[PDB]
């Protein structure tokens, strides 16, 4: 049938971390571009 | 020309973006409900979780080198400014 | 069974197809938006 | 690393700058007065005028490619902005 | 001894053009850098 | 007459000497200023 209601939660958590990971890198890149306009 | 090099790094980045995007949306739908979850197995998700983490790793690498590339634009732009504008 | 020459041809053809940076960028921008 | 490439174009540029600089100052002094002009011949000036025009041409080339390089920084900086900031 | 008072003028003119030449290129480069801070 | 090995050595030595970008730039800036 399906998987644990918490196994779902674990995966959803993992995916979130991946998202937070990529967003952090995007963040940094944006600071670089913004700081270029400032310097 | 740097326009041929740029277009490339940009192009690879766009592929890992699309790659990751498809996979994630795909996996979202499979876990969206138990009705859709029944058409898949716990060994498929296990497969997808890998496919997805592999893209993430490659995507994270591309974002990283993009960061380093922007760091270089700034250094050189800053250098030129000191040479010509100070 | 499977025609090697064709897949090759299909590869060659797509590689020779070209990227419109403007277009490329717009796809990336919508990709990033559709996620982060 | 681009820091090894940059340092080079910058370094060559600095040499043609110093080159031209020395020559010009040199030639200025020789034509500064008739007293100093008497220690040189019209075939020396002819020599210098060449040496100088050769540097000028190379210097003008370096300034030109520096311009093209800055054009590239802008294009790529502009592209990144559209990707990440729009 | 020395050279024509006008042969001097010719050379001085040539050197000036060379100068104007290089300055024009520097000018352009500066507009590029300035426009970067503006974009 | 003229020692080839030495001029070579002198070449090698100067090439291995390194550029301080900061310093480089300052020289260029003063060079441009001293002229244009």
UniProtKB/Swiss-Prot annotation, chains A, E:
Write out the annotated subcellular location. Answer: Nucleus, Nuclear pore complex; Nucleus membrane
Spell out the post-translational modification annotation for this entry. Answer: O-glycosylated.
- Reading the lineage from the top rank, the first entry is Eukaryota
The signal peptide stretch is none
- Provide the disulphide bond pattern: none
According to its UniProt record, which protein family does this protein belong to? Belongs to the NUP54 family.
Oligomeric form and interacting partners: Component of the p62 complex, a complex composed of NUP62, NUP54, and the isoform p58 and isoform p45 of NUP58. Interacts with NUTF2.
Q: What does this protein do?
A: Component of the nuclear pore complex, a complex required for the trafficking across the nuclear membrane.
Protein name per Swiss-Prot or TrEMBL: Nuclear pore complex protein Nup54
UniProtKB/Swiss-Prot annotation, chains B, D:
- Look up the domain of life of the source: Eukaryota
Q: From which residue to which does any coiled coil extend?
A: 1-41
Q: How is it modified after translation?
A: O-glycosylated.
Q: In which tissues is it expressed?
A: Expressed in liver.
The protein's location, in the record's own words, is: Nucleus, Nuclear pore complex; Nucleus membrane
Task: Say which family it is in.
Answer: Belongs to the NUP58 family.
Q: Tell me the domain comment.
A: Contains FG repeats. FG repeats are interaction sites for karyopherins (importins, exportins) and form probably an affinity gradient, guiding the transport proteins unidirectionally with their cargo through the NPC. FG repeat regions are highly flexible and lack ordered secondary structure. The overall conservation of FG repeats regarding exact sequence, spacing, and repeat unit length is limited.
The subunit structure is: Component of the p62 complex, a complex composed of NUP62, NUP54, and isoform p58 and isoform p45 of NUP58. Isoform p58 interacts with NUTF2. Isoform p58 interacts with SRP1-alpha and Importin p97 proteins when they are together, but not with SRP1-alpha protein alone.
State its role: Component of the nuclear pore complex, a complex required for the trafficking across the nuclear membrane.
Protein name, as recorded? Nucleoporin p58/p45
From Swiss-Prot, chains C, F:
**What does this protein do, in the record's words?**
Component of the nuclear pore complex, a complex required for the trafficking across the nuclear membrane.
Q: What is this protein called?
A: Nuclear pore complex protein Nup54
User: Where in or outside the cell?
Assistant: Nucleus, Nuclear pore complex; Nucleus membrane
The known PTMs are summarized as: O-glycosylated.
Give the protein family.
Belongs to the NUP54 family.
The UniProt gene name for this protein comes to Nup54
According to the record's subunit comment, the protein's assembly and interactions are:
Component of the p62 complex, a complex composed of NUP62, NUP54, and the isoform p58 and isoform p45 of NUP58. Interacts with NUTF2.
The membrane spanning regions, by residue number, are none
Any notes on this protein's domains? Contains FG repeats.
């Amino acid at each position: 049938y399906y998987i644990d209601a918490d196994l779902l939660r674990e995966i959803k958590q993992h995916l979130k971390q991946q998202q937070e990971g990529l967003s952090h890198l995007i963040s940094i890149i944006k600071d670089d571009l913004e700081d270029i306009k400032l310097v | 020309a740097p326009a041929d090099y740029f277009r490339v790094l940009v192009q690879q980045f766009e592929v890992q973006l699309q790659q990751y995007r498809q996979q994630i949306e795909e996996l979202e739908n499979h876990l969206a409900t138990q009705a859709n979850n029944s058409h898949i197995t716990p060994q498929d998700l296990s497969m997808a979780m890998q496919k997805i983490y592999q893209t993430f790793v490659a995507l994270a690498a591309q974002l990283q080198s993009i960061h380093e590339n922007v760091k270089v634009l700034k250094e050189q732009y800053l250098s030129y400014r000191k040479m010509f504008l100070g």
